[PDB]
Amino acid sequence: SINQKLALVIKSGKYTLGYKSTVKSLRQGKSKLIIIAANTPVLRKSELEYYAMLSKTKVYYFQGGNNELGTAVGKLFRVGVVSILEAGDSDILTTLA
Amino acid sequence: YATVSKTHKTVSRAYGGSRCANCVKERIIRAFLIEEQKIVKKVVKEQTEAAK
Amino acid sequence: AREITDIKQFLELTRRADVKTATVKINKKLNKAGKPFRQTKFKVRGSSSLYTLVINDAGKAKKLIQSLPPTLKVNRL
Amino acid sequence: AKFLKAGKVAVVVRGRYAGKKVVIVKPHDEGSKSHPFGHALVAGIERYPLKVTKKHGAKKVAKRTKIKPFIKVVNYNHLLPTRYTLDVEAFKSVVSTETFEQPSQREEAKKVVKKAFEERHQAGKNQWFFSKLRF
Amino acid sequence: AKRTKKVGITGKYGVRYGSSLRRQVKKLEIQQHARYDCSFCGKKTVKRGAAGIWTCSCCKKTVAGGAYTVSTAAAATVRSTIRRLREMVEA
Amino acid sequence: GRVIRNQRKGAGSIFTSHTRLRQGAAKLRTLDYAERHGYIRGIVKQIVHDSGRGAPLAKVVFRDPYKYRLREEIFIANEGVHTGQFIYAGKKASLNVGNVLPLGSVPEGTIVSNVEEKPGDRGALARASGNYVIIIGHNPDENKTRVRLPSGAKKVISSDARGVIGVIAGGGRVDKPLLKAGRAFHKYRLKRNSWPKTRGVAMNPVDHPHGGGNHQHIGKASTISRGAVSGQKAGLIAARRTGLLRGSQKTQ
RNA sequence: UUUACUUAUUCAAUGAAGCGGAGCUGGAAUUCAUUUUCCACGUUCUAGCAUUCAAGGUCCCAUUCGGGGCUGAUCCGGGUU
RNA sequence: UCUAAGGGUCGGGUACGAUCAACUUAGAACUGGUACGGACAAGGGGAAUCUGACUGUCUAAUUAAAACAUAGCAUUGCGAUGGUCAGAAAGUGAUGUUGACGCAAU
RNA sequence: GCUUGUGACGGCCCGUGAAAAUCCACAGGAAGGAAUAGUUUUCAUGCCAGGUCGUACUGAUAACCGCAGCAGGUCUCCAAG
RNA sequence: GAUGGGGAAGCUCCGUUUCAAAGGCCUGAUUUUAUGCAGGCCACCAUCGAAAGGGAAUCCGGUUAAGAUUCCGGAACCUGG
Ligand SMILES: [Mg+2]
Ligand SMILES: [Mg+2]
Ligand SMILES: [Mg+2]
Ligand SMILES: [Mg+2]
Ligand SMILES: [Mg+2]
Ligand SMILES: [Mg+2]
Ligand SMILES: [Mg+2]
Ligand SMILES: [Mg+2]
Ligand SMILES: [Mg+2]
Ligand SMILES: [Mg+2]
Ligand SMILES: [Mg+2]
Ligand SMILES: [Mg+2]
Ligand SMILES: [Mg+2]
Ligand SMILES: [Mg+2]
Ligand SMILES: [Mg+2]
Ligand SMILES: [Mg+2]
Ligand SMILES: [Mg+2]
Ligand SMILES: [Mg+2]
Ligand SMILES: [Mg+2]
Ligand SMILES: [Mg+2]
Ligand SMILES: [Mg+2]
Ligand SMILES: [Mg+2]
Ligand SMILES: [Mg+2]
Ligand SMILES: [Mg+2]
Ligand SMILES: [Mg+2]
Ligand SMILES: [Mg+2]
Ligand SMILES: [Mg+2]
Ligand SMILES: [Mg+2]
Ligand SMILES: [Mg+2]
Ligand SMILES: [Mg+2]
Ligand SMILES: [Mg+2]
Ligand SMILES: [Mg+2]
Ligand SMILES: [Mg+2]
Ligand SMILES: [Mg+2]
Ligand SMILES: [Mg+2]
Ligand SMILES: [Mg+2]
Ligand SMILES: [Mg+2]
Ligand SMILES: [Mg+2]
Ligand SMILES: [Mg+2]
Ligand SMILES: [Zn+2]
């Protein structure tokens, strides 16, 4: 599933976590896909969306809170947004997403 | 406050001595996006009307 | 109520239309750690502030006093 | 792309010029012994052209349409890159690193940039850029 | 060291009012002082501030809720009822 | 004898409401052109305790359609509504907790609060913490809507009368024992001067029908007629039955 | 006696603001000659912004700066609802 | 009259030193006409019966109580064109800035 | 250390603990403004004026109320070893 | 607690923004002239009620038989112009 694809990304690719860095990543044309927590406030969501479209980057809307997004990336804190810099051995990039 | 010069009652930004700055960051961002999404909203329903 | 330190600024004060009177006070005081030395405070009374200028150098002191406007009503001590 | 480049319009988001709109004229994507941050060199509009109408005649229009410009070194993280873009060739040379340092160099620059923007504005190229963002 | 065998917070009333009244109060006190999950920012930082008012330490949103608990059974069934009924109208 | 306690209440000298800390009266918007042809948006700005009340109030602000300014309104907050939330009021509004719609626009089964008894009266029914009314049917000809009040009563009102979706916040307030006299003290200190309460059976005859006797006791039936007279109505007024209620109540 | 009416009387509301009747357009709708009708007829991802008789259009004053009409904002009835 | 325990501040390449300033607590000697919380200050205790649960309250000036109150329990009225109450009357008034998780009455 | 002030926090509530005058700020951009010289009194300095009534003392085992220079009653601030 | 009002034989009782045609500011228009009209607003509809609540601004030293943050000396500050 999407989490298992995520979990592959995490253990074989490159990624950054959290608002500020995925904007650095978005500016630098580096992000290959961003994943957005169900409950991040619409304004941030709106902005990451504007940053993404300016950089021709695809967005995924994670069915679930920042609490669970962080468990999906195998981490014990919570994350509101994720940036794939490199699909590792996974295929998240070229599947449904 | 009437006994005291204007620079003691402002900071030199938009909404100076009134709103809090991180508050004005928010206002600006939200304004821009919403004014943009407005053009987005219009062009969709201009398209709905001609594809119906 | 107000202190002053620019010895040019001061001279201008003393000639400011509203400045009728002034006073000069002399204070024994001690230097660094050891010896003493003669301190002098020039006080110019303006309409709403008493401006006072402290000259520690007894030498600038003497010369300054000669520079005092010859119509001003100085109070010595 | 690396979308922060040679002609991007952006909204300033912090500090005095906050909320005003700029063009990037020269990007410093990473580095500077001074400014240790990604930062752009922008020319923006500080005092916008006030609106003008049919009632406005003679030299009231002339007054109404004056533009006060500004130039700024500003950290990337304080700009909202915009989808719009405005051509920057007529004052490429003018907004320089050397332009900052020495006030007199700054004032000269704005003189040019101001003449540039008032040209642009009359016969309304870049229409959006000359109308105040409200918030 | 476990300090009380069963009166918990209700220890403060000593011996007064009858064990069963203290039982009833204990339940709603635990309910009412507890820290809750914020729906909006996802931190557990919603504490009460006078019956029905529930507000978040950071992020600072306030949510009208039950007198002693953020969400009421009744409130919640109603929330889904409304949901169900709403969805009939654009469907 | 003398005027009894329940007659003195009416002149309300020391019996008026303790009103100083109150936030102001809770009311829906005035029923204007907006609310009655379309919808109008506000923002809940603040949800706040009102002394003497159980349910919190929600301060909600709307633009004035006819003048440049903000007009603030005092709602009773429904469970679930929150600061920053957008509130939609009007005929053409949509079925969300917090919005305010005329009962004619909401399907049978809808749950609502603060509903009007006539359109525009700005809200009368189901305001106390936890309460609500259920819509149980419509009669589109002569637009009426049948609802069921907290009390159990059914009543039909105009389909234009308005209501706000959901239940009033603060529920279960009464599940918790007061425990001490003092909490009732502070309870009634912010309401009105009705506490504590001497039993009439502890007063003298001058004072009350129940007063007097060499043992405490009422000495005649304590169920009093409807058509009894001021000074006589103490006890179980117009009581159609009496005694421990046995078995399921529940309006059928 | 029933059940209709509204101007008496009665109750609420609002700084008496958008009522009633028609018309424009969109269209569901099915045409038994062509329309017989019924609905609509600017706002819902976001804790921004919304005011100077409105910009636009158009006609005047005798071209000065200023300023006015109409339109933008359909018509009719003055029953505030 | 002794002993022990409990702290501060400083320089240390990318183990300790130096000093200054506080009554607490415990242990050990000695000592006296066996005294020493030396004045002051400062709970009598126990076992049961009756009775009100408690805290609170009253008869100012013969009754402080087992009386009143109280939380808790139960019953009654009422959806506003209403219930309870006020007023000689009223385009009058209390509850009511209220609405059954409410107000009023036992 | 003692008294008082104050801060950052924490406990409590079916209790969540006034109002108005008044002062400022911001959004707005009507307007009014320069080169042969304009704008500026929220920067400094400078000029004039500020009426009317109370103001002593006691505040208690003698200045108050208890028929009184009554062992009674009568609100409060300061506080050494 | 006045007032348009409504009761009351009446002394008066009710009501306080109430079922009222409820009033004044900013400058422009004057260069007969002193202030008529020209805009646009603002509809807030009395007033009394705190010497402990709110609140513009002063201090030190000296001085009397008896006054003093009030006089004298010095040095400040606020409000209006
Ligand atoms: Mg400042
Ligand atoms: Mg500005
Ligand atoms: Mg009252
Ligand atoms: Mg009482
Ligand atoms: Mg009792
Ligand atoms: Mg009782
Ligand atoms: Mg008795
Ligand atoms: Mg009797
Ligand atoms: Mg009887
Ligand atoms: Mg009896
Ligand atoms: Mg009995
Ligand atoms: Mg109306
Ligand atoms: Mg030691
Ligand atoms: Mg007892
Ligand atoms: Mg007791
Ligand atoms: Mg007695
Ligand atoms: Mg006793
Ligand atoms: Mg006694
Ligand atoms: Mg019992
Ligand atoms: Mg009448
Ligand atoms: Mg004290
Ligand atoms: Mg608080
Ligand atoms: Mg301020
Ligand atoms: Mg004009
Ligand atoms: Mg000044
Ligand atoms: Mg005067
Ligand atoms: Mg005195
Ligand atoms: Mg005496
Ligand atoms: Mg005495
Ligand atoms: Mg009166
Ligand atoms: Mg007064
Ligand atoms: Mg006072
Ligand atoms: Mg005072
Ligand atoms: Mg003195
Ligand atoms: Mg004298
Ligand atoms: Mg004296
Ligand atoms: Mg003096
Ligand atoms: Mg002087
Ligand atoms: Mg002045
Ligand atoms: Zn939160």
Residues 6+ away with beta carbon under 8 Å from D110: D69, D70, D71
Distance from CA of A42 to the nearest CA of B (A): 10
Q: Is the CB of F190 under 7 A from strand H?
A: no
Nearest partner of F113 among F133, F97, F129, F95, judged by Cα = F133
CATH of domain A1-97: 3.30.1330.30
A47 and B36 within 8 Å at the Cβ level: the answer is no
Which pair of tokens denotes residue D67? Answer: 């533009």
Ligand 35 midpoint to CA F153 (Å): 86
Amino acid at F193: N
Domains in chain A: boundaries: 1-97
Count the neighbouring beta carbons within 10 Å of the beta carbon of residue B11. Answer: 13
Query: How far is residue E68 from each of residues E30, F71, F114, F174, F242, measured CA to CA in Å?
Result: 9, 32, 22, 10, 34
Nearest partner of F226 among F236, F235, F238, judged by Cα = F238
- For residues C37 and C60, is the Cβ–Cβ distance under 8 A? no
Q: Which residues of A touch B37 (CB under 8 A)?
A: 46
B26 and A46 within 8 Å at the Cβ level: the answer is no
- State residue E62 phi and psi, 5-degree precision: -115, 135
Ligand 17 midpoint to CA E16 (Å): 21
Cα F54 off chain centre by: 10
Resolution (angstroms) equals: 2.8
State whether residue F135 is helix, strand or coil.
strand
Residues 6+ away with beta carbon under 8 Å from F193: F14, F15
CA D86 to CA D84: how far, in whole Å? 7
Burial class (CB in 10 A: 0-12, 13-18, 19+), D116: buried
- State residue C64 phi and psi, 5-degree precision: -65, -45
- For residues A72 and A47, is the Cβ–Cβ distance under 8 A? no
CA E67 to CA D39: how far, in whole Å? 52
Query: How far is residue F92 from each of residues E60, F33, F83, F101, measured CA to CA in Å?
Result: 32, 12, 23, 8
Query: Can you name the residues that pair with D71 across neighbouring β-strands?
Result: D43
Q: Which residues of A touch D81 (CB under 8 A)?
A: 27, 51, 54
Give the strand order in the sheet containing C36-45.
C2-4, C50-55, C36-45, C21-30, C73-76
Q: Is the CB of B3 under 7 A from strand J?
A: yes
- For residues F113 and F91, is the Cβ–Cβ distance under 8 A? no
Of F55, F79, F180, the CB nearest to E72: F79
- For residues D12 and A36, is the Cβ–Cβ distance under 8 A? no
H helices present in E1-91, as ranges: 19-33, 73-90
- For residues D99 and D105, is the Cβ–Cβ distance under 8 A? yes
- For residues C74 and C24, is the Cβ–Cβ distance under 8 A? yes
CA C8 to CA B32: how far, in whole Å? 55
> Which runs of E-coded beta strand occur in chain F?
40-48, 57-63, 70-76, 86-89, 100-102, 111-113, 133-139, 144-148, 154-158, 162-165, 223-224, 236-237
Handedness of CA C69, C70, C71, C72 (dihedral sign): positive
- CA dihedral (F188, F193, F194, F195) in degrees, to 10, reads 60
CA F73 to CA C42: how far, in whole Å? 66
Peptide bond into F65 cis (omega under 30): no
At residue D90's C-alpha, the angle toward residues D85 and D96, to 5°, is: 90
CA F157 to CA F161: how far, in whole Å? 7
CA F72 to CA F213: how far, in whole Å? 59
Which pair of tokens denotes residue F67? Answer: 């003048």
The structure was resolved experimentally with: X-ray
Of B12, B28, B36, the CB nearest to D13: B28
F63 CA to G49 C1' distance (Å): 12
Nearest partner of D12 among D50, D47, D46, D48, judged by Cα = D46
